[PDB]
Ligand binder design. Structure first.
Ligand SMILES: Cn1ccc(C(=O)NC[C@@H]2CCCO2)n1
Length: 152
């Protein structure tokens, strides 16, 4: 039938929120109070792909926008971008692989592994107001763990 989706926000494990600074830019910063209205709301779709008890394939679109997180090669490294799509055709159950993330439950948080690029994860920096990016380890100094808030 039709792909199922949920509206949500994400916070990294240092409790930074995500905000849209540009058509193709997401940043992470500490936020509280009225300024939380600035956070990005995602539509998380539950898409086709390999699934296990703790690992579920999803796509992450911006709520009511034809923009999705996707993973592509840039300068011979997996990179994260926002990509526009035809709004008549998305979301769909069979999302192209570059749009798919394995949502992994680990230690009461979530990680988002690229389905296209194994062991590359949606990441944030510890510094304030830096771009979200794809980080090719869950060990060192990038933040790869998140919590989800489910939104009306
Ligand atoms: C205009 N600008 C400067 C830096 C960036 C950037 O890194 N964009 C990518 C991130 C990953 C997902 C969307 O934003 N864009």
């Amino acid at each position: 039938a039709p792909v199922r989706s949920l509206n949500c926000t994400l916070r990294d494990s240092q409790q930074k929120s995500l905000v849209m600074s540009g058509p193709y830019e997401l940043k992470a910063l500490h936020l509280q109070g009225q300024d939380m209205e600035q956070q990005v709301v995602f539509s998380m779709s539950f898409v086709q792909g390999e699934e296990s008890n703790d690992k579920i394939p999803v796509a992450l679109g911006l709520k009511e926008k034809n923009l999705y997180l996707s993973c592509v090669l840039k300068d011979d490294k997996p990179t994260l971008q926002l990509e526009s799509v035809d709004p008549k055709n998305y979301p769909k159950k069979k999302m192209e692989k570059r749009f798919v993330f394995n949502k992994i439950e680990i230690n009461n948080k979530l990680e988002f592994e690229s389905a296209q690029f194994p062991n590359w994860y949606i990441s944030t920096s510890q510094a304030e107001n830096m771009p979200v990016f794809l980080g090719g380890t869950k060990g060192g100094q990038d933040i790869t763990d998140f919590t989800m808030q489910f939104v009306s």
